[PDB]
Each structure stands twice: as C-alpha cells, then as structure tokens.
Design a protein around this ligand. Structure first.
Ligand SMILES: O=c1ccn([C@H]2C[C@H](O)[C@@H](COP(=O)(O)O)O2)c(=O)[nH]1
Ligand SMILES: O=c1ccn([C@H]2C[C@H](O)[C@@H](COP(=O)(O)O)O2)c(=O)[nH]1
Lengths: 316, 316
C-alpha cells in the first residue's frame, strides 16, 4: 500500500540497526542514510496503521507558513506540540517564582506528584500566554523556530529574508530550476540553540507539470516523529502546488540518522502486525490560492479510517 | 564491483530520466531523488571504467581544507578546474583592456579562432595570478567558494566560523553526535552568487568506531561531475577519519536533480560496455595527523588501473 515505505523503514531499522547510545539515557537502534519516496497521486501518506492527529499537523504547518514563532497561535488551536520549549524559558526566567521544575520531563516521567505539580504549572503558563499580551510576547515567542527560518532568515545588514516566499515565486517564473532550496540550518545559531533543526533542508522540483519535494532530515524518531513529518511535508507539497497551479508529484524523504528508541520496540512490532488500508484524500479550498492566508477550514482530509492509536513513552 | 552504483545511476537515468530543459541550451535526462552508498573498506571509489585525474581531486580538496579561495594555489599545482570563474571577473573588470571575450565558453565552443584568442588570453591571466601579488589578490580570489564556506562562514557581528574545524572537534568529543553537519548553503548569498553550491551540505556519522559521511548534492552532472565528487568526498571521509583515529565506514551520496546532458549520451553508453576492475587503495601519511597541514606528498593511491579516458563536450 501507499505507506509501505514507512513500515519498511521500521522493519529495516529493527533488522540491521546498530545500538547507538543516544545522548539521553534511552538507547537507540539507528542507521545512517535512507531514502523513501511517496507518490502523492495515490493518496495522502497519512498512516492508516496507527491514528495520527491530523489537526496537530495542519495547525502547526500553518503556524510555520505565517512565519509565526509564538506559541499563542498553537494554544489557540489546542496545539501543545511546542509548549515545553517555551515553558523551559519560563522556569529558567529570573522572573519565575514557584516550584523547582528543574530537569523536568525526565523527572516528570518518574515522580507522579511532581508530574501533577508540573502539569498544574504548565496550565497556568499556557493560560498566561493566551491572555497576557506582554507575557506572551516575552515567553511565548520562541524566536529561532521553523517559521522565522523559512520566512525571516536574518541578514548581516540587519535585514530579513523570506526564503519560502521567494522560492515559490522562483517556481512560478523558473519551474525548471535546480535551486529551489530552503535551508533551516544556520551556522552562527546552530551551536547556541537548544535544538538545531531536525528537518534541515528541502528542495522543490518541477517536471511535466508535476511538483515533487525532497526533505533531508538529519535526525529522526522512526516511531513518534516520522509519521508526522511525512504529513507536514506531503501537505506543504500540496499547498505550494495549489498556489502554483501545478500537480503533485512525490515526496522524497531522505534521512541522516534514523532511530528507534528502545522503549518503543514492542510498540513498533505491534504496528507491524497491522495491514495498511486505502489512503485518505486531501482537498484544498479551490476558491483560495494564497497559501499564506490559509486557515484550518481550507484544508480537508477525506476517508481516513485508521487502526487505533499506539501509545508509547517519549524518550527524554 | 565497488563502483557499480555509479553505473547503475547512469543506467537508470537513461532508462527513466525525463527530458528536462536545462537552463543552458543542452537538454538533459534528469531524475529527482537518488541515493548511492559506497563501502570504503572495500576500496577507494575512484572509477576504473574511465580514467579520472586523481591529481586534480587531491589538489582541489586540499585547497578547500586550507580554507583557501584564491586560484593561485591551483595554478601552482597545474590545476585549472576553477580558472573560468576567476577569469570572468577579469573580462568583466573595468580594468580589462583587450579582446571581446563576451559570452565565451559558449562561443569558444564554436568559433575556432576565438577559441585560440580566448586561450592565449587565459594563459596571460593565469601567468599574472601566479606572479603579480596585487593582481592575484584582486582577481585570483574567488571569495565565496567551498573553502571559505567550510572554514570561514561569515557571522553577523563581523565574525567568521570554522564549520569544519569545529565539527572535527565535535567528532572527537561527541562521536555519537547527530549534529555533525557542514552547510555550504547561505541564503543571503545564494541569490547574488553566479553559482550557488552544488554540494550543498554533508553529515558525518560515527558508530562502532567507523566513520561514514552523507553528501546532499542538489544538482549533478552524472557523466562529467559525479566521478570527481565521489572521490573528493570519499577522500575527505578518509582524512577526517585519519585525524580522528577512526576507521572508514561508507560514503552515502544523496542527489536532488541528477542529470545527463544529451551531448554525452553516446559517451555514457560506451562506458557502460566496460567492466569494472578491482578498486585502488588510498594511503595517508601515518606520521602526519593534522589534515589541514597536509600536502600532496601525504596522500597516495595504489593500483589504479583504469580503462582509457572518455572525452565529451562540456555543456554550457
Ligand atoms: O516529531 C519529531 C520530534 C523530534 N524528533 C527527534 C529527533 C531526535 O530524536 C531528537 C533530536 O536529537 P538531536 O538530533 O538534537 O541530538 O528529536 C523527531 O524525529 N520527530
Ligand atoms: O564537477 C561538477 C561540476 C559542475 N556540476 C554541474 C551541475 C550542473 O550541471 C551545473 C550547475 O547548474 P545549476 O544547478 O546552477 O542550475 O554544474 C556537477 O555536477 N559536477
């Protein structure tokens, strides 16, 4: 079926992955170098073998397109995929006055009471970011995230560059260009950042009036991460095509280090027991073509009938 | 044999490559997304099916390691791989006083007399760059080439960053790092440059004490370019390992747009008639480990017995 590459990726990592000590504490079965390609004319590569919350994919991607970098948009759409990154700044704040919260996550995955204290706290933080404008502006703004990297690369002469906005024009005027690249990797930031970009760089390609996209991902979590990345980029490939009045080609997902944390082995084996079903169908608002001004309403998924969700401990 | 992936790449591009109109005039058979991997413990991937001048590979790579950007080093080693890039600046110079030389290359590949005028000129230019220090400093310095991108990325606060020098340390202190990346793609330069980097970004990877490297190449000339790129990077993989006292793993060559200009079809078909031979063996100076201070003498190739060279018109 349409999603088999993903399953083959997991199968292969189990078979010939080497035990590599991940920086955390959790070991990993990893491989270096791998490429998968999904034909977008056959179906949206949203996995049928395990329920993946498409809402979190749309909301987050749109956030990126707007060149946004403030959690607020996310919380406004019930999206917490990025909370912890902003929250950390709060607890590290010279202004923070409350419980310990140090090395949380790690200890939040152990002490049950702490987990409750930590959750009560985070809730108050999310509330603030939603109502207090000064606060949101202060801690709710991540800064160097995908949004500004794609839409506001910072120039030497204090300028800012709209990598994407420019590439899309490039596609329209030079469809056969081999320079339709967007990088999220910047040397002067890379060392100081808490988390250098995982989706490091991508390339668009046009031919026969079909649009393909290649994503070089330096590091990946085969079980908890990849299923989401496939959708974000399959969808972005759709959005750019929609605006460019072009058809969709394929999504080529190239990997650097692909890994499967040891605490997910049982879960991935179980998923493999399952048999893929026909893929869902994406549908974008025909009356709308400016993909930046897009909103949730303008992107719909049809016939997504997955197997139940598989739960697993996030390794950290 | 060791080099089969390269042949399979050419075979495949011939079979299912689409006629894509290359920006030049020469058409191309291209494909998007492709990955090849060479196991470096079996042999140096220097092609046996066609004579490839290793000298031009060594000299040029070393040039890069020194963080050099001035043609002079190259001409000093009888290397002209970069002349035209510097030469163009000469003819576009407000100081240039001599023959037309406009849209050369194109017209140098047509008019035989012009080709001779053009060659006489270039010779005088190469001579100047070798003896006139002011001149060399002025036109012999390319500026934004691989050397400075790897060794002198320009920071906002006027600084410069030694991407490579840092990554190599990173390998030594954090061998299991998934952030051993070096980018040659910079957004603020990319539009103004005459030729944005083809070898866009690479990643090192260490495991079981073996060192691998992945090269994302956005655009490639299957016939005239790829055989050289395989060597440059296979060798760099060797040099870093040598300094890091690590073994060699594999070279993974990921492609964006792989193409074969139409004026090379007959030549590639001929090469395919040939049958690969045992690969040569690289050997690096054991008494020397600082790969930046390296020189020609410290890198040797053993048993390279190729088929004769295949000549073909450079498309431009
Ligand atoms: O959806 C996601 C979120 C995170 N990561 C993972 C990749 C690594 O497991 C970790 C980053 O580790 P470093 O590469 O920074 O060392 O985050 C994914 O692959 N997918
Ligand atoms: O050794 C070399 C030298 C040059 N190129 C080619 C790639 C393209 O044919 C051309 C650059 O075209 P653009 O990508 O800039 O459009 O130079 C190679 O692949 N290998």
């Amino acid at each position: 079926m349409l999603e088999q590459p993903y399953l083959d990726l997991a199968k292969k990592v189990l078979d010939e992955g080497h035990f590599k000590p991940d920086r955390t504490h959790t070991g990993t079965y990893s491989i270096f170098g791998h490429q998968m390609r999904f034909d977008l004319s056959k179906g949206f590569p949203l996995l049928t073998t395990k329920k993946v919350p498409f809402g979190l994919i749309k909301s987050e991607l749109l956030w990126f397109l707007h060149g946004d970098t403030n959690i607020r948009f996310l919380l406004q759409h019930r999206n917490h995929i990025w909370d912890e990154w902003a929250f950390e700044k709060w607890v590290k704040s010279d202004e923070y006055h409350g419980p310990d919260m140090t090395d949380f996550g790690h200890r939040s995955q152990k002490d049950p009471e702490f987990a409750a204290v930590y959750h009560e706290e985070m809730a108050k933080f999310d509330d603030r970011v939603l109502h207090d404008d000064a606060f949101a502006a202060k801690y709710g703004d991540l800064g160097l995230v995908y949004g500004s990297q794609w839409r506001a690369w910072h120039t030497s002469k204090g300028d800012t560059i709209d990598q994407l906005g420019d590439v899309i024009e490039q596609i329209k005027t030079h469809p056969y260009s081999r320079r339709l690249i967007v990088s999220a990797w910047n040397p002067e930031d890379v060392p100081t950042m808490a988390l250098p970009p995982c989706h490091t760089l991508y390339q668009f390609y046009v031919n026969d009036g079909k649009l393909s996209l290649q994503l070089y991902q330096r590091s990946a979590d085969i079980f908890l991460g990849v299923p989401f990345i496939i959708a974000s980029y399959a969808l972005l490939t759709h959005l750019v095509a929609h605006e460019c009045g072009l058809e969709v080609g394929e999504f080529i997902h190239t990997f650097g280090d692909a890994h499967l944390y040891v605490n997910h082995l049982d879960q991935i084996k179980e998923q493999l027991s399952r048999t893929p079903r026909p893929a869902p169908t994406l549908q974008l608002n025909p009356d709308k073509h400016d993909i930046f001004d897009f909103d949730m309403k303008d992107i719909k998924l049809l016939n997504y009938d997955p197997y139940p969700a598989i739960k697993a401990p996030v390794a950290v």
